[PDB]
Every structure is written in structure tokens, then in C-alpha cells.
Design a protein around this ligand. Structure first.
Ligand SMILES: [Ca+2]
Length: 461
């Protein structure tokens, strides 16, 4: 027997999110965990393009927190920038006026120095943006039945059953990773899927572990959407790498009564091919049921504007770097504890952008509003994986780590891979972020961000 896959409540849209500590059980041991309106994770907030909703956020924890609307094209005031800290027992109200295509976004704490720990404790929620366009496509759309969110996260636990989180020299170097895989908070759950097409909204919500999705019988995954929404057409893939914080929506066929698994395949990332992730690892069991769903795989999904002329656009260079000491010690501890499988394929300001660890009150530059810019992000100089996330925008990747992006990564993205080479993205910011509410750009390997690999920037007309 497997647990049934939990489905976050879809909150149709004033909304309250109460941030609080509860309890969860994993393999018969109880752990203190944190959730939005629950023990763990959070709801799926449903937003309609062009309609405003106010979100009341109440912090019932005993420590400060913040909330990042990951993927939303909103003013910097929504996250709050440096003015976004919600004290224990405090509250903050924001207004979300969505003006972007349909997409699956998400939200999560984002306080510098504490983001890894607060996500590890359980905090994460979803944002389902809908528009007029996507509803004409007749995709699978019955939430929790044939339209299913899949939030995949690893954790590790102490002997006493508690979540075993630490920001130490080793995790500052390679990230916090564990040996237990959760799917919407459950270990290897099952989902009962109607015959036809099954839509999976995939979110890599790990602190540091990259994932690579596939099916146990290697049937195709039809990618229909990236971080920022629909592709122009479905893209058939046999495997789907997903970086930390990225989302993809895929359709998979359910065409007989035999169960199969969604799995994740071993990645070439420091520390992440350690057992039990040295082999394909099940994510969830898909059990077909003898009732039809009528959702379709459309031949065409959407229209993607042409990349504009790069002639005359501002080019901003961002160099990612890691203190050489941190690299050395952290590497040595990883090798000492886990051996060769770890390579299969002060430290609190040691990770930097442009030679600077994040300074919350000094934005690095002012970006133009409503103008395309080319941002060049280099990881030359270290071998670590850095998924690079830019707030306030959905951008287009021009070069992903020294190569043009894969077709299913060539649409709307808020994250780009950087791993030893150079990426280039085309960004435009439609909304204001003054100094007091600055946007951020940062590595989404959370322990890197927490140890300085983040910058602030403003946006003004
Ligand atoms: Ca509901």
C-alpha cells in the first residue's frame, strides 16, 4: 500500500495565508513542520489575469519570515524587498494584479540567510494563473483528477525524527540534500488517473537537488509549459531535467490499465548522485482507473513573440563566484563522508556576485523599465550548479550555459542554468521596484543564496 497523493487545495479568488508550525509524519516518525494554512506546503492560489486579489499574510511562527511570489510579474513592493520582513505575530497585506500569461508559479519564504532553512521546514505554495487563452485549449483541467500538481522535494531527518537542517561549510558549498523524496509531502504516493491524458504541473522544490523526470517505461512526456507559461507547441521529451524552483507542465498518456511510475533519473551534480539517487528513483505511482477524461493534447498551444534585435540593448555582466576556501573545505567534507559517488559524473558571505556578497540595502544597479536588456551570467571559475533566478519578469534564454537552450526551455523562463560556463538571457521589467522594495536576482541553490550569492536591483521609468 502507498499513500494517496495529497492535492493542495485550489483557492479560487480576499485570501488569508497563515504561516504556522504544525506536525507531519514520515516513515512512522513525527516531525515539526511548517505550512501555509496547514502542517506542510500550502494551497494553490488561483489568479485570473487582469483581476486583482488581496492576500493577507499572517506570521504565526516565532521567527521572522518573508514571502516571494516566484514567477510573478509584479511591482517590487509585493515581495517588499528590504521592507518585506514579517515579524513574528505580524501581518502584511499585498495586492496581486496579474498581467502575464497563464502559468504555474509558486511562493515560498525568501529571507537572506534563512531561505534554505524555512523552505526545508516545509513552507511552499502554488500560484495557478489562468487567462482567456489557456481555457480555449481544452487541456486536462479537473484539479486533482487529471490536472495534478507535483511538488518534488528531498529532506533528511535526524534520529529523533526531526528535519535535519544545517547551514554549515559543507552545505554552503554543495547545498542541503537528503535521502528521502517527498511528493506533495508524501513518500512515493499513488495517483488514480483517468484514461486519456494526464496533466502534471511539476515543481522542483528542493533546496539544492536538480531533478530529471521520466516515466518508468520511458513513454514520452509532452511538455506544454515552462516557468512562465505555455510553449507555442508541445515538445515531446524522453526525460525532463528540472532545476531548483523551475516548473514545467507536461501531458502523459494513460492508455491501458497497467500502473507506471513517474521517476527521476540520476543527475551529474555534486552530491546528488549519492545513494539512493545513484539509480532511477520513483516519484509517484500512476494507477489508471476505468473512467475517461476528455482533456486533449492540442496541436498548437500559444504564440511566442519574436526575439527582438539585440542591436543597441544594454548588456549587464554578472559574475558568480565562490570563495576558494569554502570550495575546498566543503568539497573535502563531502568526499570524506560519501566517497567517490559524491562526484559520480566565516562562510556566510563567501558566495558572491560581481565580487560582492548580498547587501540588502545597496542595490547593485538600476535596470530600465519597459526596455529589453541582455544579462550575461557567468559561472566560469567553479564547478557548482547555479540555477539563476531573476525577480519581476519572465525572460527568454538566449544562451544556456554556453549552448542555445533546448526547445522546451526557449519560451518563458524565470530561471536559467549556470554551471561552469556562461548564460545570456533577454529580460524586460514592466513594473517599478524602488530602492526600498528592490527586486532580487540570485542563485536558487538556496544555501548559495543564503551565503551571499544574490544581488538587489531597482527598476524605474
Ligand atoms: Ca477550492
Amino acid at each position: 500500500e502507498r499513500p494517496t497523493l495529497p492535492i493542495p487545495d485550489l483557492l479560487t479568488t480576499r485570501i488569508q495565508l497563515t504561516i504556522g508550525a504544525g506536525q507531519s509524519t514520515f516513515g512512522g516518525k513525527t516531525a515539526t513542520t511548517w505550512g501555509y494554512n496547514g502542517n506542510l506546503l500550502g494551497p494553490a492560489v488561483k489568479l485570473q489575469r487582469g483581476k486583482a486579489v488581496t492576500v493577507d499574510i499572517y506570521n504565526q511562527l516565532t521567527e521572522e519570515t518573508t514571502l516571494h511570489w516566484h514567477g510573478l510579474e509584479v511591482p517590487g513592493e509585493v515581495d517588499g524587498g528590504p521592507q518585506g520582513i514579517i515579524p513574528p505575530g505580524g501581518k502584511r497585506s499585498v495586492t496581486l494584479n496579474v498581467d502575464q500569461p497563464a502559468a504555474t508559479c509558486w511562493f515560498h519564504p525568501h529571507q537572506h540567510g534563512k531561505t534554505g532553512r524555512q523552505v526545508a521546514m516545509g513552507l511552499a505554495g502554488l500560484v495557478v494563473i489562468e487567462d482567456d487563452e489557456i481555457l480555449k485549449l481544452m487541456l486536462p483541467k479537473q484539479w486533482g483528477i487529471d490536472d495534478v500538481p507535483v511538488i518534488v522535494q528531498d529532506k533528511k531527518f535526524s534520529a529523533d525524527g526531526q528535519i535535519d537542517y544545517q547551514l554549515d561549510v559543507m552545505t554552503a558549498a554543495v547545498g542541503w540534500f537528503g535521502d528521502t523524496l517527498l511528493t506533495n509531502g508524501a513518500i512515493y504516493p499513488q495517483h488514480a488517473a483517468p484514461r486519456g491524458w494526464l496533466r502534471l504541473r511539476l515543481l522542483n522544490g528542493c533546496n539544492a537537488r536538480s531533478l530529471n523526470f521520466a516515466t518508468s517505461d520511458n513513454r514520452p512526456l509532452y511538455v506544454i509549459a515552462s516557468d512562465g507559461g505555455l510553449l507555442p507547441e508541445p515538445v515531446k521529451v524522453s526525460e525532463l531535467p528540472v532545476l531548483m524552483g523551475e516548473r514545467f507542465e507536461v501531458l502523459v498518456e494513460v492508455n491501458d490499465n497497467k500502473p507506471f511510475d513517474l521517476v527521476t533519473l540520476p543527475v551529474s551534480q555534486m552530491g546528488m548522485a549519492i545513494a539512493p539517487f545513484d539509480k532511477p528513483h520513483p516519484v509517484m505511482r500512476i494507477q489508471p482507473i476505468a473512467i475517461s477524461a476528455s482533456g486533449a493534447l492540442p496541436d498548437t498551444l500559444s504564440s511566442l513573440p519574436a526575439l527582438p534585435s539585440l542591436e543597441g540593448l544594454t548588456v549587464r555582466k554578472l559574475q558568480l563566484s565562490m570563495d576558494p576556501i569554502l570550495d575546498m573545505m566543503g568539497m573535502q567534507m563531502l568526499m570524506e563522508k560519501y566517497g567517490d559517488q559524491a562526484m559520480a559524473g566565516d562562510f556566510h558571505h563567501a558566495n558572491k556576485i560581481n565580487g560582492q556578497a548580498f547587501d540588502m540595502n545597496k542595490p547593485m544597479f538600476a535596470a530600465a523599465k519597459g526596455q529589453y536588456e541582455r544579462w550575461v551570467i557567468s559561472g566560469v571559475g567553479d564547478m557548482m550548479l547555479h540555477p539563476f533566478h531573476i525577480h519581476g519578469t519572465q525572460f527568454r534564454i538566449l544562451s544556456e550555459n554556453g549552448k542555445p537552450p533546448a526547445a522546451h526551455r526557449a519560451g518563458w523562463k524565470d530561471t536559467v542554468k549556470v554551471e561552469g560556463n556562461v548564460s545570456e538571457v533577454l529580460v524586460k521589467f514592466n513594473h517599478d521596484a524602488p530602492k526600498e522594495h528592490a527586486y532580487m536576482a540570485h542563485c536558487h541553490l538556496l544555501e548559495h543564496e543564503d551565503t551571499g550569492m544574490m544581488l538587489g536591483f531597482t527598476v524605474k521609468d
